[PDB]
Amino acid sequence: MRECISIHVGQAGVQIGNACWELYCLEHGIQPDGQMPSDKTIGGGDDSFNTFFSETGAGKHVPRAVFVDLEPTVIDEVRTGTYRQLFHPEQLITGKEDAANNYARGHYTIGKEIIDLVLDRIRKLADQCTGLQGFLVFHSFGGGTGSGFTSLLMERLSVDYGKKSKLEFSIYPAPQVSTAVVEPYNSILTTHTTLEHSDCAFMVDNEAIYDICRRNLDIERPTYTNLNRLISQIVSSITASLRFDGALNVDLTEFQTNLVPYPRIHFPLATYAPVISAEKAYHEQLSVAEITNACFEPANQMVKCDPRHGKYMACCLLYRGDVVPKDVNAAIATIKTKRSIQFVDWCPTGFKVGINYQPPTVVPGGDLAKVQRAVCMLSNTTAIAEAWARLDHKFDLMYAKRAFVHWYVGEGMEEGEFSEAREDMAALEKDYEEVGVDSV
Amino acid sequence: REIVHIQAGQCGNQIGAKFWEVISDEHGIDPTGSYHGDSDLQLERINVYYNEAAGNKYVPRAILVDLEPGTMDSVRSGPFGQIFRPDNFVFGQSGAGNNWAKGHYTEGAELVDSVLDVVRKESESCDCLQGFQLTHSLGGGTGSGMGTLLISKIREEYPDRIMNTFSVVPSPKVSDTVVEPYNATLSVHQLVENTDETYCIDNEALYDICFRTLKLTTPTYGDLNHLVSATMSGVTTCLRFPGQLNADLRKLAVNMVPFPRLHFFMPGFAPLLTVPELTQQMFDAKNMMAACDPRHGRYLTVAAVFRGRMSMKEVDEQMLNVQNKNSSYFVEWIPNNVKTAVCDIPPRGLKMSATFIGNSTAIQELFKRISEQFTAMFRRKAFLHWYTGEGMDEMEFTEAESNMNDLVSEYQQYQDATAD
Amino acid sequence: KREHEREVIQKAIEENNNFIKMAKEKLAQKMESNKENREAHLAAMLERLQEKDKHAEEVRKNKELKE
Ligand SMILES: Nc1nc2c(ncn2[C@@H]2O[C@H](COP(=O)(O)OP(=O)(O)OP(=O)(O)O)[C@@H](O)[C@H]2O)c(=O)[nH]1
Ligand SMILES: Nc1nc2c(ncn2[C@@H]2O[C@H](COP(=O)(O)OP(=O)(O)OP(=O)(O)O)[C@@H](O)[C@H]2O)c(=O)[nH]1
Ligand SMILES: [Ca+2]
Ligand SMILES: [Mg+2]
Ligand SMILES: [Mg+2]
């Protein structure tokens, strides 16, 4: 059992979803038609990969996933693409008209017309689960659907499935690939309305991914395809513990216990290594020590910020491939004597470690070298609040003039929702400050 | 998805027809409405502007309106004249004689209902109408008076749809018709309240470009319209081809219009070529289609569209370079206010081009120039009997002027505003 | 101790139900308030437009009653 339902909302959520499911198929030996010849239990089972895939009597392995967008063109590519047979048509849901980069349209005007249908489809997936663990929700901060429809959905999910866990993968905006001036508004509105409905949220800063693609993959001008293939490897690392067995595997829930000291402080920093091209990986094997030490290089983080100028509340290392504890412990010992790792005085300083033995996979035509071992660090650091500070400042600059606010007011929103959202973010920045102060 | 196109009056129909010629060529649609192109990118968003009829014929979603019949004959005989739906031609007999009140209150009111019947029939069969684009001039009577009436009536029936205009602003350098500044002021009063987005295509600027830059000693309507059609192709590229940025009229409005009244854009085009050169030229005063110096104001928002095969790295770097070296001209309180799209398909006869759409507080210079010409006549009540004879009061002129002066002050307010 | 055990689990049930309830009522209040605001925005726009149609009638009359 232990089923997890993935929900992909808007363009960013959908396209990241495509990259993740493609990768999961390759990792588990599932073909594009859904067949998995290695699975000898036809039509069911309680294998570790069944947390993410259900099975039909005809041997098809079907993602436990709903894709939702308010216009049809991105989801139409899934319907006509390589993995079209993977998904039942009812899992792929589209409207006719998008949210036009406006939270208010995604949450209210357009989103309201489709929310009951989406919950209906999610319910069909939930009814097939014998021990549903919870939801994984993929979306942008900046789009109208990724912001506004996601908030509406998260609120409705708390109503319909109570405290059942909900995790996010949230794409934080960057100017090199952003498509709207109002993204800071949409990011603050959704963060505010979703904060009480999410147990844990993994922010992915497009600018950090964009820079990693340029600096480490030698990609001159990264596209969404480049960014998403890398994002999917990080997602896969995080979810690998739910999808594979092994004696040193540590479930995501157990990392969560350590990552979330108070409900609002639920935003881990992910750092992934190694991100290396094929031309550089050839005849240069990276060891456990090298990949682990790369987790403390800010340039490998998924969110731009500087952990050397905040405090740690937890550090978790999620390894995959050819990795034994002895080498992990020796790498950690070395790092502690050399680096700026300062914990708050109320948390213990031990790193929590999981190892899944199944090695990393790459997608054909990809940019990443295939490697024997990789690691994703999940740290709870006060430094992640910097990402909130940058976004809050941009919000203030515009909001002091009410720039663009009439677009939201014209869809039925009030100014009071803006300032309520902004004050919740001010209090969040303040929470992150208070947790790093010493105990008296 | 679908856009409904309306062209009104002589100017509107002439620039309208050229728009359809230029985009039908870019999409591989010939004058019979048959597709004979080489690339699936041409057909992927074809339904934005064209209906499909029987026999894989593509028919512009286009309505052709005038109070003067005969503009209908000249369009119908033009190179692409057979492509338009015959029932979408709606023409009166009278003319409007360069009188806005005839277009808006008397002659145009008589004809407006039959135009709406055609609008509704086109709209009814749209899968998901996004809105409307109107091509017209502001200096005559039909495009100006009747065009702004149509806008108001359309808005009543489709209040949640986007209304976009390509509005040709008058200049003494191109028409000597003396009442043009009245007709333009009265129109601007309408546009300020009832459009979401207006491309100010200024006959002053088109003339100055043909004369100074292109070295044409006596520019014709054909030479002015060559600039208008390249601009219109450019500013609708994002609507017509697959792409990320400003892909529909509402998303463009949301990116470009920070306050609802300040929705008058300065278009530009280059060339009139390396990526650094396109980029410098597209931001040059001499390449703007509104006679305004952008260095006399500040940019609220900008869309830059590059077309052709070029390095996206170089485009990003140059866009960043212009913003950095010209930072004082972009308002600091709208972060990241310049957006860039690159489309692989160049326009006809160029390897590379750039189209510029600016929401600049310098547009106030256009309105002030019209305002000056308006007042010079209005202070002596000159030529007013043409308008009072159709039932209008002086008070309506006073209000229109005052509202356009308010628009000017508002553009000035945001220019002077500071972050701190 | 058995009675304390029963109070802990009822307190948990009560807090979960209360969370669901408050989230259900908040959402319903927001969606109502948003509907009314949007409709009031559209109704004001239509009302300005009807005032224009009314004024256009006063213009055609002024012209009729001029002659
Ligand atoms: N990493 C990544 N980011 C994306 C992708 N697509 C869009 N984004 C980012 O997401 C934000 C834009 O929101 P989208 O997801 O496109 O919009 P949407 O959710 O479809 O919302 P509407 O289109 O307004 O209804 C910007 O910050 C984009 O850079 C993607 O495939 N990958
Ligand atoms: N750029 C450009 N301007 C034009 C063209 N035709 C007319 N104009 C301008 O439009 C204004 C005159 O309006 P017209 O469109 O000719 O008048 P109308 O809308 O047909 O109205 P009436 O003739 O009064 O019924 C003047 O400023 C002209 O310079 C054209 O093809 N291109
Ligand atoms: Ca099985
Ligand atoms: Mg979208
Ligand atoms: Mg005429």
JSON list of N, CA and C and ligand atoms in Angstrom, two decimals, chain A residues 9-13 15-16 69-71 98-102 139-147 171-174 177-180 183 206 224-225 227-228 231, chain B residues 244 251, ligand 1:
[
{"chain": "A", "resi": 9, "resn": "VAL", "atom": "N", "xyz": [-0.08, 20.89, -11.69]},
{"chain": "A", "resi": 9, "resn": "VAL", "atom": "CA", "xyz": [-0.97, 22.00, -11.92]},
{"chain": "A", "resi": 9, "resn": "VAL", "atom": "C", "xyz": [-0.30, 23.10, -12.75]},
{"chain": "A", "resi": 10, "resn": "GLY", "atom": "N", "xyz": [-0.95, 23.46, -13.87]},
{"chain": "A", "resi": 10, "resn": "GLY", "atom": "CA", "xyz": [-0.43, 24.47, -14.78]},
{"chain": "A", "resi": 10, "resn": "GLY", "atom": "C", "xyz": [0.76, 24.02, -15.61]},
{"chain": "A", "resi": 11, "resn": "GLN", "atom": "N", "xyz": [1.25, 24.92, -16.47]},
{"chain": "A", "resi": 11, "resn": "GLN", "atom": "CA", "xyz": [2.29, 24.58, -17.40]},
{"chain": "A", "resi": 11, "resn": "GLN", "atom": "C", "xyz": [3.49, 23.97, -16.68]},
{"chain": "A", "resi": 12, "resn": "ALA", "atom": "N", "xyz": [4.07, 24.71, -15.71]},
{"chain": "A", "resi": 12, "resn": "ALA", "atom": "CA", "xyz": [5.29, 24.28, -15.03]},
{"chain": "A", "resi": 12, "resn": "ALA", "atom": "C", "xyz": [5.08, 22.93, -14.32]},
{"chain": "A", "resi": 13, "resn": "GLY", "atom": "N", "xyz": [3.96, 22.81, -13.63]},
{"chain": "A", "resi": 13, "resn": "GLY", "atom": "CA", "xyz": [3.63, 21.58, -12.96]},
{"chain": "A", "resi": 13, "resn": "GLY", "atom": "C", "xyz": [3.50, 20.41, -13.90]},
{"chain": "A", "resi": 15, "resn": "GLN", "atom": "N", "xyz": [4.76, 20.14, -17.12]},
{"chain": "A", "resi": 15, "resn": "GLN", "atom": "CA", "xyz": [5.98, 19.80, -17.86]},
{"chain": "A", "resi": 15, "resn": "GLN", "atom": "C", "xyz": [7.00, 19.13, -16.94]},
{"chain": "A", "resi": 16, "resn": "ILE", "atom": "N", "xyz": [7.10, 19.60, -15.70]},
{"chain": "A", "resi": 16, "resn": "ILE", "atom": "CA", "xyz": [7.91, 18.90, -14.70]},
{"chain": "A", "resi": 16, "resn": "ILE", "atom": "C", "xyz": [7.38, 17.47, -14.44]},
{"chain": "A", "resi": 69, "resn": "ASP", "atom": "N", "xyz": [-4.74, 21.64, -16.14]},
{"chain": "A", "resi": 69, "resn": "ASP", "atom": "CA", "xyz": [-4.36, 22.96, -16.60]},
{"chain": "A", "resi": 69, "resn": "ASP", "atom": "C", "xyz": [-5.64, 23.65, -17.07]},
{"chain": "A", "resi": 70, "resn": "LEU", "atom": "N", "xyz": [-5.67, 24.96, -17.01]},
{"chain": "A", "resi": 70, "resn": "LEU", "atom": "CA", "xyz": [-6.84, 25.73, -17.46]},
{"chain": "A", "resi": 70, "resn": "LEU", "atom": "C", "xyz": [-6.91, 26.08, -18.95]},
{"chain": "A", "resi": 71, "resn": "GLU", "atom": "N", "xyz": [-5.84, 25.89, -19.68]},
{"chain": "A", "resi": 71, "resn": "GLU", "atom": "CA", "xyz": [-5.92, 25.84, -21.16]},
{"chain": "A", "resi": 71, "resn": "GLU", "atom": "C", "xyz": [-5.40, 24.47, -21.62]},
{"chain": "A", "resi": 98, "resn": "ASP", "atom": "N", "xyz": [-7.06, 30.09, -19.99]},
{"chain": "A", "resi": 98, "resn": "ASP", "atom": "CA", "xyz": [-6.19, 30.02, -18.84]},
{"chain": "A", "resi": 98, "resn": "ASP", "atom": "C", "xyz": [-6.42, 31.17, -17.84]},
{"chain": "A", "resi": 99, "resn": "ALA", "atom": "N", "xyz": [-5.58, 31.26, -16.80]},
{"chain": "A", "resi": 99, "resn": "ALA", "atom": "CA", "xyz": [-5.72, 32.28, -15.77]},
{"chain": "A", "resi": 99, "resn": "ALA", "atom": "C", "xyz": [-5.01, 33.60, -16.07]},
{"chain": "A", "resi": 100, "resn": "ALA", "atom": "N", "xyz": [-4.42, 33.68, -17.26]},
{"chain": "A", "resi": 100, "resn": "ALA", "atom": "CA", "xyz": [-3.80, 34.90, -17.76]},
{"chain": "A", "resi": 100, "resn": "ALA", "atom": "C", "xyz": [-2.83, 35.56, -16.72]},
{"chain": "A", "resi": 101, "resn": "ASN", "atom": "N", "xyz": [-2.02, 34.71, -16.04]},
{"chain": "A", "resi": 101, "resn": "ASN", "atom": "CA", "xyz": [-1.01, 35.17, -15.07]},
{"chain": "A", "resi": 101, "resn": "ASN", "atom": "C", "xyz": [-1.56, 35.93, -13.88]},
{"chain": "A", "resi": 102, "resn": "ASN", "atom": "N", "xyz": [-2.80, 35.60, -13.52]},
{"chain": "A", "resi": 102, "resn": "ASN", "atom": "CA", "xyz": [-3.59, 36.29, -12.52]},
{"chain": "A", "resi": 102, "resn": "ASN", "atom": "C", "xyz": [-4.12, 35.25, -11.53]},
{"chain": "A", "resi": 139, "resn": "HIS", "atom": "N", "xyz": [3.70, 22.74, -8.97]},
{"chain": "A", "resi": 139, "resn": "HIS", "atom": "CA", "xyz": [3.16, 23.93, -9.57]},
{"chain": "A", "resi": 139, "resn": "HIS", "atom": "C", "xyz": [4.15, 25.10, -9.52]},
{"chain": "A", "resi": 140, "resn": "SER", "atom": "N", "xyz": [3.94, 26.08, -10.38]},
{"chain": "A", "resi": 140, "resn": "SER", "atom": "CA", "xyz": [4.66, 27.34, -10.27]},
{"chain": "A", "resi": 140, "resn": "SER", "atom": "C", "xyz": [4.03, 28.26, -9.25]},
{"chain": "A", "resi": 141, "resn": "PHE", "atom": "N", "xyz": [4.87, 29.14, -8.69]},
{"chain": "A", "resi": 141, "resn": "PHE", "atom": "CA", "xyz": [4.41, 30.30, -7.92]},
{"chain": "A", "resi": 141, "resn": "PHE", "atom": "C", "xyz": [3.84, 31.38, -8.84]},
{"chain": "A", "resi": 142, "resn": "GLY", "atom": "N", "xyz": [4.38, 31.50, -10.05]},
{"chain": "A", "resi": 142, "resn": "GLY", "atom": "CA", "xyz": [4.18, 32.71, -10.82]},
{"chain": "A", "resi": 142, "resn": "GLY", "atom": "C", "xyz": [3.01, 32.75, -11.77]},
{"chain": "A", "resi": 143, "resn": "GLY", "atom": "N", "xyz": [2.62, 31.60, -12.30]},
{"chain": "A", "resi": 143, "resn": "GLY", "atom": "CA", "xyz": [1.48, 31.55, -13.15]},
{"chain": "A", "resi": 143, "resn": "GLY", "atom": "C", "xyz": [0.16, 31.70, -12.43]},
{"chain": "A", "resi": 144, "resn": "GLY", "atom": "N", "xyz": [-0.89, 32.03, -13.19]},
{"chain": "A", "resi": 144, "resn": "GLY", "atom": "CA", "xyz": [-2.23, 32.20, -12.62]},
{"chain": "A", "resi": 144, "resn": "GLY", "atom": "C", "xyz": [-2.83, 30.89, -12.11]},
{"chain": "A", "resi": 145, "resn": "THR", "atom": "N", "xyz": [-2.58, 29.80, -12.84]},
{"chain": "A", "resi": 145, "resn": "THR", "atom": "CA", "xyz": [-3.11, 28.49, -12.53]},
{"chain": "A", "resi": 145, "resn": "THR", "atom": "C", "xyz": [-2.21, 27.88, -11.44]},
{"chain": "A", "resi": 146, "resn": "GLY", "atom": "N", "xyz": [-0.89, 27.93, -11.63]},
{"chain": "A", "resi": 146, "resn": "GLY", "atom": "CA", "xyz": [0.02, 27.36, -10.66]},
{"chain": "A", "resi": 146, "resn": "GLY", "atom": "C", "xyz": [-0.12, 28.02, -9.30]},
{"chain": "A", "resi": 147, "resn": "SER", "atom": "N", "xyz": [-0.42, 29.32, -9.27]},
{"chain": "A", "resi": 147, "resn": "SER", "atom": "CA", "xyz": [-0.67, 30.03, -8.01]},
{"chain": "A", "resi": 147, "resn": "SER", "atom": "C", "xyz": [-2.08, 29.85, -7.50]},
{"chain": "A", "resi": 171, "resn": "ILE", "atom": "N", "xyz": [7.76, 26.01, -7.98]},
{"chain": "A", "resi": 171, "resn": "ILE", "atom": "CA", "xyz": [8.75, 26.65, -8.83]},
{"chain": "A", "resi": 171, "resn": "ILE", "atom": "C", "xyz": [8.71, 28.16, -8.57]},
{"chain": "A", "resi": 172, "resn": "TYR", "atom": "N", "xyz": [9.80, 28.64, -7.97]},
{"chain": "A", "resi": 172, "resn": "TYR", "atom": "CA", "xyz": [10.00, 30.00, -7.54]},
{"chain": "A", "resi": 172, "resn": "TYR", "atom": "C", "xyz": [10.57, 30.83, -8.74]},
{"chain": "A", "resi": 173, "resn": "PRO", "atom": "N", "xyz": [10.08, 32.06, -8.93]},
{"chain": "A", "resi": 173, "resn": "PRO", "atom": "CA", "xyz": [10.30, 32.70, -10.22]},
{"chain": "A", "resi": 173, "resn": "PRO", "atom": "C", "xyz": [11.73, 33.22, -10.38]},
{"chain": "A", "resi": 174, "resn": "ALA", "atom": "N", "xyz": [12.19, 33.20, -11.63]},
{"chain": "A", "resi": 174, "resn": "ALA", "atom": "CA", "xyz": [13.39, 33.87, -12.02]},
{"chain": "A", "resi": 174, "resn": "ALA", "atom": "C", "xyz": [13.22, 34.71, -13.30]},
{"chain": "A", "resi": 177, "resn": "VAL", "atom": "N", "xyz": [13.63, 33.30, -17.22]},
{"chain": "A", "resi": 177, "resn": "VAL", "atom": "CA", "xyz": [12.59, 32.51, -17.91]},
{"chain": "A", "resi": 177, "resn": "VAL", "atom": "C", "xyz": [11.14, 32.90, -17.47]},
{"chain": "A", "resi": 178, "resn": "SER", "atom": "N", "xyz": [10.96, 34.00, -16.75]},
{"chain": "A", "resi": 178, "resn": "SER", "atom": "CA", "xyz": [9.61, 34.41, -16.33]},
{"chain": "A", "resi": 178, "resn": "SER", "atom": "C", "xyz": [8.84, 35.05, -17.44]},
{"chain": "A", "resi": 179, "resn": "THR", "atom": "N", "xyz": [7.51, 34.94, -17.33]},
{"chain": "A", "resi": 179, "resn": "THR", "atom": "CA", "xyz": [6.58, 35.36, -18.38]},
{"chain": "A", "resi": 179, "resn": "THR", "atom": "C", "xyz": [5.57, 36.40, -17.90]},
{"chain": "A", "resi": 180, "resn": "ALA", "atom": "N", "xyz": [5.64, 36.76, -16.62]},
{"chain": "A", "resi": 180, "resn": "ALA", "atom": "CA", "xyz": [4.79, 37.84, -16.14]},
{"chain": "A", "resi": 180, "resn": "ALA", "atom": "C", "xyz": [5.45, 38.75, -15.09]},
{"chain": "A", "resi": 183, "resn": "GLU", "atom": "N", "xyz": [4.33, 38.14, -11.23]},
{"chain": "A", "resi": 183, "resn": "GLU", "atom": "CA", "xyz": [4.67, 36.89, -10.52]},
{"chain": "A", "resi": 183, "resn": "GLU", "atom": "C", "xyz": [4.93, 37.08, -9.03]},
{"chain": "A", "resi": 206, "resn": "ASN", "atom": "N", "xyz": [14.07, 28.78, -10.16]},
{"chain": "A", "resi": 206, "resn": "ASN", "atom": "CA", "xyz": [14.47, 28.65, -11.57]},
{"chain": "A", "resi": 206, "resn": "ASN", "atom": "C", "xyz": [15.81, 29.25, -11.87]},
{"chain": "A", "resi": 224, "resn": "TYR", "atom": "N", "xyz": [13.31, 25.18, -20.72]},
{"chain": "A", "resi": 224, "resn": "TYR", "atom": "CA", "xyz": [12.54, 24.38, -19.83]},
{"chain": "A", "resi": 224, "resn": "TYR", "atom": "C", "xyz": [12.86, 22.91, -19.87]},
{"chain": "A", "resi": 225, "resn": "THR", "atom": "N", "xyz": [13.17, 22.39, -21.05]},
{"chain": "A", "resi": 225, "resn": "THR", "atom": "CA", "xyz": [13.52, 20.99, -21.14]},
{"chain": "A", "resi": 225, "resn": "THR", "atom": "C", "xyz": [14.80, 20.74, -20.33]},
{"chain": "A", "resi": 227, "resn": "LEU", "atom": "N", "xyz": [15.93, 22.57, -17.85]},
{"chain": "A", "resi": 227, "resn": "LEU", "atom": "CA", "xyz": [15.69, 22.79, -16.43]},
{"chain": "A", "resi": 227, "resn": "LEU", "atom": "C", "xyz": [14.91, 21.62, -15.83]},
{"chain": "A", "resi": 228, "resn": "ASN", "atom": "N", "xyz": [13.94, 21.12, -16.57]},
{"chain": "A", "resi": 228, "resn": "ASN", "atom": "CA", "xyz": [13.08, 20.08, -16.07]},
{"chain": "A", "resi": 228, "resn": "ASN", "atom": "C", "xyz": [13.73, 18.74, -15.91]},
{"chain": "A", "resi": 231, "resn": "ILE", "atom": "N", "xyz": [15.55, 19.18, -12.66]},
{"chain": "A", "resi": 231, "resn": "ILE", "atom": "CA", "xyz": [14.56, 19.17, -11.59]},
{"chain": "A", "resi": 231, "resn": "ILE", "atom": "C", "xyz": [14.08, 17.73, -11.33]},
{"chain": "B", "resi": 244, "resn": "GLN", "atom": "N", "xyz": [5.83, 31.39, -25.54]},
{"chain": "B", "resi": 244, "resn": "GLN", "atom": "CA", "xyz": [5.70, 31.46, -24.11]},
{"chain": "B", "resi": 244, "resn": "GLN", "atom": "C", "xyz": [5.08, 32.77, -23.62]},
{"chain": "B", "resi": 251, "resn": "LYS", "atom": "N", "xyz": [-3.07, 38.19, -21.39]},
{"chain": "B", "resi": 251, "resn": "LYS", "atom": "CA", "xyz": [-1.73, 38.09, -20.80]},
{"chain": "B", "resi": 251, "resn": "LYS", "atom": "C", "xyz": [-0.85, 39.27, -21.21]},
{"chain": "D", "resi": 1, "resn": "LIG", "atom": "N1", "xyz": [11.16, 24.98, -14.33]},
{"chain": "D", "resi": 1, "resn": "LIG", "atom": "C1", "xyz": [10.11, 25.32, -15.10]},
{"chain": "D", "resi": 1, "resn": "LIG", "atom": "N2", "xyz": [9.47, 26.49, -14.91]},
{"chain": "D", "resi": 1, "resn": "LIG", "atom": "C2", "xyz": [8.42, 26.81, -15.72]},
{"chain": "D", "resi": 1, "resn": "LIG", "atom": "C3", "xyz": [7.97, 25.92, -16.76]},
{"chain": "D", "resi": 1, "resn": "LIG", "atom": "N3", "xyz": [6.90, 26.49, -17.38]},
{"chain": "D", "resi": 1, "resn": "LIG", "atom": "C4", "xyz": [6.70, 27.68, -16.77]},
{"chain": "D", "resi": 1, "resn": "LIG", "atom": "N4", "xyz": [7.59, 27.85, -15.79]},
{"chain": "D", "resi": 1, "resn": "LIG", "atom": "C5", "xyz": [7.65, 28.99, -14.87]},
{"chain": "D", "resi": 1, "resn": "LIG", "atom": "O1", "xyz": [6.37, 29.11, -14.22]},
{"chain": "D", "resi": 1, "resn": "LIG", "atom": "C6", "xyz": [6.01, 30.51, -14.20]},
{"chain": "D", "resi": 1, "resn": "LIG", "atom": "C7", "xyz": [4.84, 30.77, -15.17]},
{"chain": "D", "resi": 1, "resn": "LIG", "atom": "O2", "xyz": [3.71, 29.98, -14.78]},
{"chain": "D", "resi": 1, "resn": "LIG", "atom": "P1", "xyz": [3.14, 28.76, -15.66]},
{"chain": "D", "resi": 1, "resn": "LIG", "atom": "O3", "xyz": [3.22, 27.42, -14.96]},
{"chain": "D", "resi": 1, "resn": "LIG", "atom": "O4", "xyz": [3.59, 28.80, -17.08]},
{"chain": "D", "resi": 1, "resn": "LIG", "atom": "O5", "xyz": [1.60, 29.25, -15.76]},
{"chain": "D", "resi": 1, "resn": "LIG", "atom": "P2", "xyz": [0.22, 28.49, -15.47]},
{"chain": "D", "resi": 1, "resn": "LIG", "atom": "O6", "xyz": [0.32, 27.75, -14.13]},
{"chain": "D", "resi": 1, "resn": "LIG", "atom": "O7", "xyz": [-0.03, 27.66, -16.72]},
{"chain": "D", "resi": 1, "resn": "LIG", "atom": "O8", "xyz": [-0.75, 29.75, -15.29]},
{"chain": "D", "resi": 1, "resn": "LIG", "atom": "P3", "xyz": [-1.59, 30.51, -16.48]},
{"chain": "D", "resi": 1, "resn": "LIG", "atom": "O9", "xyz": [-0.91, 30.10, -17.74]},
{"chain": "D", "resi": 1, "resn": "LIG", "atom": "O10", "xyz": [-1.52, 31.94, -16.05]},
{"chain": "D", "resi": 1, "resn": "LIG", "atom": "O11", "xyz": [-3.00, 29.97, -16.35]},
{"chain": "D", "resi": 1, "resn": "LIG", "atom": "C8", "xyz": [7.28, 31.28, -14.61]},
{"chain": "D", "resi": 1, "resn": "LIG", "atom": "O12", "xyz": [8.08, 31.57, -13.46]},
{"chain": "D", "resi": 1, "resn": "LIG", "atom": "C9", "xyz": [7.96, 30.31, -15.56]},
{"chain": "D", "resi": 1, "resn": "LIG", "atom": "O13", "xyz": [9.38, 30.43, -15.70]},
{"chain": "D", "resi": 1, "resn": "LIG", "atom": "C10", "xyz": [8.70, 24.66, -16.88]},
{"chain": "D", "resi": 1, "resn": "LIG", "atom": "O14", "xyz": [8.37, 23.80, -17.74]},
{"chain": "D", "resi": 1, "resn": "LIG", "atom": "N5", "xyz": [9.73, 24.45, -16.06]}
]
